[PDB]
Amino acid sequence: AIQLALDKRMCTVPQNLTAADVYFREVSQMEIIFECLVDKEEADLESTSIDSVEWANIVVNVNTILKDMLHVACQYRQSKN
Amino acid sequence: LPAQWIHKAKAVRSRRDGDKHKEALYLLKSHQWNQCHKLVTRHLAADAVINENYRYLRGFLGELARPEHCKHIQDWETAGKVYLDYISVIEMLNQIRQDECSGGELEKLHTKVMSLCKWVELIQCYSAKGRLAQSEMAKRVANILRVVLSLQQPP
Amino acid sequence: LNCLRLIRPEYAWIVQPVSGAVYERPGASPKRNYDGESSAVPSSSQIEILELRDLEKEYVLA
């Protein structure tokens, strides 16, 4: 998702920096990663067939991650209001 | 003393006690073909065809196939070299599998399978166990026939 | 039992099925059981055929 968002963002990466480093530097546009994840999600789930545990595991992972960012943003906002 | 006598000892002792590794060899040497039938066919044929351990079995069928034996044997052709040719067919198919292009061997296999498809069912079913043997034999020969017909198709 | 004692004697036997290969809630992990734990398995490399008398004894048990 990081590299896909980098492609969609067409921002250069210095060799001293890395892809994740550049993405994490300009925090203004990190939102691209969620829909990149989602696109990869349907791409994989089209292929996923029956008798697949990753079929649910991937969704579990993404659910936890997104809930966690919403969680941390909410708590920081509430604490620092 | 010739081991002839010793292996007669082992032959009767196994006739009484049941050690296949010895009855097979020694009865074959002693020209006991009907008994070798009612042992190998009854037990080992089914065992090996079910369990895919055909090495020892092919050894015994080869030693059975001896024409010096065969001239005194009756109906070795009827079942024995029958199973033996099935072994030849599957093994040279595996040869074909390790190969990529051999038409002058695919045609041999095709002639062999056409010949065997009409000789599979004449025997077997001495019992329900014979029925099982015949069923597996016919199913495998049909599978091999469809395989060879599919592989002998133009690209 | 009924299905088979219907039949003529040629089909009078059935192979014993192979052990395992069951789970619940389709699309799940390959192994699921309610009565678990084991220390050995019946021979599945060598299969067996099940006949009227065998089936009669199993029914008698049941």
**Secondary structure of B67-121 in the HEC alphabet?**
HHHHCCCCCHHHHHHHHHHHHHHHHHHHHHHHCCCCHHHHHHHHHHHHHHHCCCC
Q: Which two tokens stand for residue A59?
A: 């969704």
Distance separating alpha carbons of residues B124 and B141, to the nearest angstrom: 14
- Rounded alpha-carbon distances, angstroms, from residue B15 to B26, B40, B61: 10, 14, 20
Please return the burial class of C21, using the count of CB atoms within 10 Å of its CB with bins 0-12, 13-18 and 19+.
Answer: exposed
Whether chain C has a CB inside 8 Å of the CB on A76: the answer is: no
With a CB cutoff of 8 Å and minimum separation 6, the contacts of B107 are B152
Residues in chain A within 8 Å Cβ distance of C27:
50-52, 55
Burial pattern B31-61, b for ≥16 Cβ within 10 A else e, equals ebbeebbebbbeebbbebbbeeebeebeebb
Q: Which two tokens stand for residue C42?
A: 């019946």
B131/C45 touch (CB, cutoff 8 Å), yes or no: no
Distance separating alpha carbons of residues A52 and C10, to the nearest angstrom: 42
At C15, which helix (H) or strand (E)?
A: strand C13-15
Residues forming a β-bridge with C50? C14
Whether chain B has a CB inside 8 Å of the CB on C1: the answer is: no
- A19 neighbors A6 (Cβ within 8 angstroms): yes
- B96 neighbors B102 (Cβ within 8 angstroms): yes
Whether chain C has a CB inside 8 Å of the CB on B129: the answer is: yes
Residues forming a β-bridge with C14? C50
- B36 neighbors B24 (Cβ within 8 angstroms): yes
Distance separating alpha carbons of residues B100 and B5, to the nearest angstrom: 51
β C49-51/C13-15 pair status: antiparallel
| Cited resolution, angstroms | 8.1
Burial pattern B69-103, b for ≥16 Cβ within 10 A else e, equals beeebeebeebbbbbbbbbbbeebbeebeeeeeee
Residues forming a β-bridge with C15? C49
- A33 neighbors A5 (Cβ within 8 angstroms): yes
Whether chain B has a CB inside 8 Å of the CB on C10: the answer is: yes
Residue type, C7: I
Method used to obtain the model: cryo-EM
Taking CA atoms, what residue in C is nearest to B47?
A: C46
Distance separating alpha carbons of residues B124 and B131, to the nearest angstrom: 6
Three-state SS at B123:
coil
C28/A55 touch (CB, cutoff 8 Å), yes or no: no
Give the position of tokens 């599919």.
B150
